[PDB]
mmCIF file of C-alpha atoms in Angstrom:
data_model
loop_
_atom_site.group_PDB
_atom_site.id
_atom_site.type_symbol
_atom_site.label_atom_id
_atom_site.label_comp_id
_atom_site.label_asym_id
_atom_site.label_seq_id
_atom_site.Cartn_x
_atom_site.Cartn_y
_atom_site.Cartn_z
ATOM 1 C CA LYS A 1 0.055 0.080 0.004
ATOM 2 C CA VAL A 2 1.143 3.546 -1.244
ATOM 3 C CA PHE A 3 -0.249 5.634 1.586
ATOM 4 C CA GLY A 4 -1.647 9.229 0.950
ATOM 5 C CA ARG A 5 0.115 12.016 2.635
ATOM 6 C CA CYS A 6 -2.598 13.250 5.163
ATOM 7 C CA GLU A 7 -3.672 9.484 5.176
ATOM 8 C CA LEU A 8 -0.428 8.234 6.440
ATOM 9 C CA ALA A 9 -0.171 11.138 9.062
ATOM 10 C CA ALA A 10 -3.604 10.175 10.605
ATOM 11 C CA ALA A 11 -2.673 6.445 11.050
ATOM 12 C CA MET A 12 0.655 7.505 12.603
ATOM 13 C CA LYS A 13 -1.083 9.724 14.883
ATOM 14 C CA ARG A 14 -3.428 6.970 15.824
ATOM 15 C CA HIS A 15 -0.633 4.721 16.703
ATOM 16 C CA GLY A 16 0.910 7.032 19.205
ATOM 17 C CA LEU A 17 3.676 8.458 17.028
ATOM 18 C CA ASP A 18 2.860 12.339 17.138
ATOM 19 C CA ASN A 19 5.362 13.657 19.921
ATOM 20 C CA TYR A 20 6.805 10.387 20.583
ATOM 21 C CA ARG A 21 10.084 11.092 22.127
ATOM 22 C CA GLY A 22 9.546 14.425 21.421
ATOM 23 C CA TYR A 23 9.483 14.207 17.582
ATOM 24 C CA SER A 24 6.529 15.994 16.138
ATOM 25 C CA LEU A 25 4.001 14.513 13.574
ATOM 26 C CA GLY A 26 5.555 16.356 10.601
ATOM 27 C CA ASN A 27 9.101 14.550 11.312
ATOM 28 C CA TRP A 28 7.853 11.160 11.027
ATOM 29 C CA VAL A 29 5.605 11.927 7.798
ATOM 30 C CA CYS A 30 8.937 13.423 6.379
ATOM 31 C CA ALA A 31 10.784 10.562 7.074
ATOM 32 C CA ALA A 32 8.280 8.233 5.489
ATOM 33 C CA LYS A 33 8.296 10.166 2.264
ATOM 34 C CA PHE A 34 12.115 10.131 1.948
ATOM 35 C CA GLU A 35 12.578 6.453 3.080
ATOM 36 C CA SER A 36 9.837 4.633 1.183
ATOM 37 C CA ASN A 37 7.935 7.427 -0.585
ATOM 38 C CA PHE A 38 4.782 6.303 1.509
ATOM 39 C CA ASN A 39 4.907 2.756 -0.092
ATOM 40 C CA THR A 40 4.519 -0.042 2.503
ATOM 41 C CA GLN A 41 6.210 -2.810 0.195
ATOM 42 C CA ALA A 42 9.431 -0.866 -0.197
ATOM 43 C CA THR A 43 12.719 -3.021 0.136
ATOM 44 C CA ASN A 44 16.150 -1.801 -0.434
ATOM 45 C CA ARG A 45 19.408 -4.009 -0.139
ATOM 46 C CA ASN A 46 22.457 -2.766 1.766
ATOM 47 C CA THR A 47 26.103 -3.149 0.928
ATOM 48 C CA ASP A 48 26.578 -5.084 4.167
ATOM 49 C CA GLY A 49 24.141 -7.941 3.283
ATOM 50 C CA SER A 50 21.224 -6.639 5.290
ATOM 51 C CA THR A 51 18.024 -5.138 3.905
ATOM 52 C CA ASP A 52 15.557 -2.106 4.791
ATOM 53 C CA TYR A 53 11.921 -2.810 5.070
ATOM 54 C CA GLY A 54 8.666 -1.023 5.098
ATOM 55 C CA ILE A 55 7.352 2.549 5.221
ATOM 56 C CA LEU A 56 10.234 3.601 7.276
ATOM 57 C CA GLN A 57 12.833 1.152 5.988
ATOM 58 C CA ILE A 58 13.705 -0.888 9.076
ATOM 59 C CA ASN A 59 17.138 -2.666 8.993
ATOM 60 C CA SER A 60 17.207 -6.379 9.183
ATOM 61 C CA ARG A 61 20.840 -6.396 10.908
ATOM 62 C CA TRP A 62 19.350 -5.291 14.400
ATOM 63 C CA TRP A 63 15.585 -5.005 14.411
ATOM 64 C CA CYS A 64 13.860 -7.761 12.266
ATOM 65 C CA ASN A 65 14.547 -11.292 10.937
ATOM 66 C CA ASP A 66 14.988 -12.208 7.282
ATOM 67 C CA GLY A 67 16.842 -15.186 7.620
ATOM 68 C CA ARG A 68 19.494 -14.222 5.230
ATOM 69 C CA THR A 69 21.419 -11.725 7.463
ATOM 70 C CA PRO A 70 24.171 -13.482 9.196
ATOM 71 C CA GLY A 71 25.443 -12.211 12.739
ATOM 72 C CA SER A 72 22.004 -10.542 12.830
ATOM 73 C CA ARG A 73 19.584 -9.583 15.752
ATOM 74 C CA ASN A 74 15.945 -9.871 15.888
ATOM 75 C CA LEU A 75 15.074 -6.863 18.649
ATOM 76 C CA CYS A 76 11.666 -6.135 17.189
ATOM 77 C CA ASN A 77 10.910 -9.869 17.425
ATOM 78 C CA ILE A 78 9.075 -10.005 14.005
ATOM 79 C CA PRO A 79 9.688 -11.218 10.536
ATOM 80 C CA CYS A 80 10.790 -8.464 8.356
ATOM 81 C CA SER A 81 7.922 -9.364 5.866
ATOM 82 C CA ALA A 82 5.533 -8.325 8.458
ATOM 83 C CA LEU A 83 6.948 -4.741 8.083
ATOM 84 C CA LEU A 84 5.598 -4.734 4.453
ATOM 85 C CA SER A 85 1.735 -4.916 5.527
ATOM 86 C CA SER A 86 -0.855 -2.498 4.615
ATOM 87 C CA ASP A 87 -1.127 -2.193 8.427
ATOM 88 C CA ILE A 88 1.587 0.072 9.576
ATOM 89 C CA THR A 89 1.140 -1.214 13.396
ATOM 90 C CA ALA A 90 4.295 -3.533 13.183
ATOM 91 C CA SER A 91 6.539 -0.888 11.433
ATOM 92 C CA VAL A 92 5.038 1.624 14.002
ATOM 93 C CA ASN A 93 5.956 -0.390 17.214
ATOM 94 C CA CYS A 94 9.268 -1.485 15.848
ATOM 95 C CA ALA A 95 10.304 2.345 14.897
ATOM 96 C CA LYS A 96 9.269 3.385 18.526
ATOM 97 C CA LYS A 97 12.035 0.857 19.680
ATOM 98 C CA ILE A 98 14.410 2.402 17.120
ATOM 99 C CA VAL A 99 14.032 6.038 17.921
ATOM 100 C CA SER A 100 14.543 5.184 21.669
ATOM 101 C CA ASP A 101 17.831 3.520 21.035
ATOM 102 C CA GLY A 102 19.850 6.521 21.981
ATOM 103 C CA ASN A 103 20.476 8.545 18.868
ATOM 104 C CA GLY A 104 16.977 9.563 18.512
ATOM 105 C CA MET A 105 15.572 10.070 14.528
ATOM 106 C CA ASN A 106 19.297 10.127 13.654
ATOM 107 C CA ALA A 107 18.855 6.445 13.005
ATOM 108 C CA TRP A 108 17.090 7.207 9.857
ATOM 109 C CA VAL A 109 19.880 8.818 7.617
ATOM 110 C CA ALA A 110 17.288 10.009 5.012
ATOM 111 C CA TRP A 111 15.592 12.030 8.101
ATOM 112 C CA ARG A 112 18.998 13.384 9.320
ATOM 113 C CA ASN A 113 19.954 14.596 5.716
ATOM 114 C CA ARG A 114 16.658 15.726 4.241
ATOM 115 C CA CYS A 115 14.173 16.345 7.199
ATOM 116 C CA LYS A 116 16.203 17.404 10.136
ATOM 117 C CA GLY A 117 16.278 21.276 10.570
ATOM 118 C CA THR A 118 13.494 21.854 8.128
ATOM 119 C CA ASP A 119 10.046 22.955 8.206
ATOM 120 C CA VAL A 120 8.562 19.865 9.185
ATOM 121 C CA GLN A 121 5.082 20.921 9.957
ATOM 122 C CA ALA A 122 4.593 21.674 6.117
ATOM 123 C CA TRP A 123 4.171 17.709 5.893
ATOM 124 C CA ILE A 124 0.699 17.747 7.689
ATOM 125 C CA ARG A 125 -0.323 20.530 5.224
ATOM 126 C CA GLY A 126 -4.252 20.991 5.448
ATOM 127 C CA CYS A 127 -4.548 17.451 6.861
ATOM 128 C CA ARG A 128 -7.990 16.993 8.801
ATOM 129 C CA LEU A 129 -6.242 16.578 12.349
#
């Protein structure tokens, strides 16, 4: 599922992401656009052998399990394929544990390079919230 802009912001707000760890809603929506372009089935291979999954591109080296990343951890205790569902519930709960891992939102290289320091509020433009 390729979410709509204001459609995805509503589902993230319902799942408790707005101001989660002090990060406004426009930040999370900004990170989605620049990690997966709002597409739930996005996948990208990394150079070290791991793979990013889902609407916020969660890495298999540490968080989920794909059975093909040797020496990996499964911190979110889920199959990485669960991060590709039309329901972002699994991706939201796993990202809550990522942003709480010390470095904050910096764990998403796209957010730090394309969202951090910008007018993130412009991403919830005209959304019925």
